[PDB]
Design a protein around this ligand. Structure first.
Ligand SMILES: c1ccc2c(NC3CCCCC3)nc(C3CC3)nc2c1
Length: 305
């Protein structure tokens, strides 16, 4: 079995009305939100979404989706709802791009060269453990560690060419007393202890998946504080999970990367440290407004290119 392309199997693809202004897969899927997508063929993005493998590709006006499960067929309208939810396609980006463009002139400039930078709505467990794997790491090496984590502890879904896709591990799988030693063997280093000890904390102390739904329904301030009780989850990782899985669109994760960007392109300086990081966060919330994390995604994606 091989990765599908739109050209070679058109009947297996369902289309979503989606202009390049609302979504660019190439500025979203590889741009440090999810680490589960690879361009396995030009303009064709393959990855695990809701425990199934998908390939996504787009033309000027449409997003095209295929799902690998039986006999091959088009995604059902119900299956496509997972895709709509993941890309938050209810949110009209054009309205957000204008509002940011008005209140910030550098952004306005970047925005018309980098259309369709959306924020994924990610599964809380996948997002939490992926961003625990993100510390002191580039996108390349994070992607590798997450792949090896899922290979070890997640269910095998399918093989396409020489890529074996796994579901994201459950809390139960990551909480086991052998997990930390095995994840060290896979090169996660110090992040191994964080993954295993956080899985255990969530299961035994916080009450499982119910806690991450509770944090979804809570304020940014509550949810951020709540996440920072987990081994390996400080301001940076808490802000990532807040923005990308817990619907806190005002969350702005700040590292040395976001800092070289604000230094150069915004003539900012601390009046890199916890105190200086929080100031920077506050600035971007003051400037861009209640969806500041989304505006940050445009600049970060832009900067990676
Ligand atoms: C490794 C992996 C991912 C990221 C990352 N992802 C951003 C997070 C906020 C918006 C969208 C994606 N951001 C940053 C900096 C804050 C800019 N560093 C990373 C280092």
């Amino acid at each position: 079995m091989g990765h599908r392309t739109l050209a070679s199997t058109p009947a297996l693809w369902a289309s979503i009305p989606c202009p390049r202004s609302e979504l660019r897969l190439d500025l979203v899927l590889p741009s440090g939100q999810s680490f589960r997508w690879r361009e396995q063929s030009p303009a064709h993005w393959s990855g695990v979404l809701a425990d199934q493998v998908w390939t996504l590709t787009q033309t000027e006006e449409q997003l095209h989706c295929t799902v690998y499960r039986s006999q091959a067929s088009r995604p059902t309208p119900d299956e496509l709802e997972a895709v709509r939810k993941y890309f938050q396609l209810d949110v009209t980006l054009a309205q957000l791009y204008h509002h940011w463009g008005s209140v910030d002139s550098h952004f306005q400039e970047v925005a018309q060269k980098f259309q369709g930078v959306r924020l994924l709505r990610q599964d809380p467990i996948e997002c939490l453990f992926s961003f625990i794997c993100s510390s002191n790491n580039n996108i390349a090496r994070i992607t590798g560690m997450v792949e090896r984590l899922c290979q070890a502890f997640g269910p095998r879904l399918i093989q396409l060419d020489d890529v074996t896709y796994h579901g994201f591990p459950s809390l139960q799988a990551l909480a086991g007393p052998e997990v930390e030693a095995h994840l060290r063997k896979l090169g996660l280093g110090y992040r191994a202890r964080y993954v295993s000890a956080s899985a255990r904390a969530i299961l035994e102390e916080q009450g499982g998946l119910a806690w991450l739904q509770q944090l979804r329904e809570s304020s940014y301030e509550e949810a951020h504080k709540a996440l920072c009780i987990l081994p390996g989850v400080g301001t940076k990782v808490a802000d990532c999970i807040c923005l990308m899985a817990l619907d806190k669109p005002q969350a702005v994760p700040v590292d040395v990367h976001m800092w070289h960007i604000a230094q150069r392109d915004y003539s900012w300086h601390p009046t890199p440290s916890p105190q200086t990081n929080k100031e920077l966060g506050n600035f971007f919330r003051s400037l861009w407004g209640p969806y500041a994390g989304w505006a940050q995604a445009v600049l970060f994606s832009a900067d990676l290119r």
